Design a protein around this ligand. Structure first.
Ligand SMILES: CO[C@@H]1O[C@@H]2CO[C@](C)(C(=O)O)O[C@H]2[C@H](O)[C@@H]1NC(C)=O
Ligand SMILES: CO[C@@H]1O[C@@H]2CO[C@](C)(C(=O)O)O[C@H]2[C@H](O)[C@@H]1NC(C)=O
Length: 165
């Protein structure tokens, strides 16, 4: 049993995570954009990329956006939907939150969301967060509304990959 840095080393090896330019530093106290997390999900679950397609109307969401193949893939898969359907906004530059990540992983893992869960999560996310908590993907005193740290995401990702046989 294996430190957060060691889990990151393993996930980086398997191409799931990448680090930052000019440094081998994992920066586990830093946040992560929704674009970066979409990639992580794609690699975590071996989803196929989707090129030449753009389903969202965010500014600079187009063929010059390195993240679009990943954002399209997690969207076809049902793991992510964006933040509103009417305006078709994904918010690729915003940071992934623990309750958002929770949604994605609970769904990818086909776990049962909890009806009428009591916790601090946003309404739409309460069953997702509670299920993610009970799966050991996030700690029960993580803040569901806070941006997830890279440490928390390494831990959640590593645990999730375990749950896939
Ligand atoms: C700003 O450079 C980027 O940093 C990103 C950090 O978060 C993740 C999910 C990661 O793999 O660590 O994605 C990284 C990008 O791949 C990119 N990294 C590099 C080395 O250019
Ligand atoms: C603001 O509405 C929420 O946005 C969340 C963004 O993160 C994810 C994981 C997403 O699907 O991309 O979950 C979204 C929630 O379902 C919710 N989005 C909607 C359209 O209701």
């Amino acid at each position: 049993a294996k430190t957060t840095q060691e889990k990151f080393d393993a996930l980086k090896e398997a191409g799931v995570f990448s680090g930052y330019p000019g440094t081998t530093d994992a920066k586990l106290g830093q946040d992560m954009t929704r674009a970066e997390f979409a990639k992580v999900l794609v690699k975590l679950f071996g989803l196929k990329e989707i090129h030449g397609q753009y389903s969202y109307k965010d500014k600079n969401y187009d063929a010059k956006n390195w993240a679009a193949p990943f954002i399209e893939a997690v969207t076809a898969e049902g793991l992510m939907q964006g933040k509103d359907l009417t305006k078709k906004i994904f918010d690729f530059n915003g940071k992934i939150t623990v309750e958002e990540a929770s949604k994605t992983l609970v769904t990818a893992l086909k776990l049962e969301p909890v009806k009428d869960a009591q916790n601090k999560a946003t309404d739409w996310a309460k069953g997702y967060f509670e299920a993610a908590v009970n799966a050991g993907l996030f700690s029960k005193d993580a803040n569901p509304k806070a941006n997830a740290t890279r440490a928390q995401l390494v831990e959640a990702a590593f645990a999730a990959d375990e749950m896939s046989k």
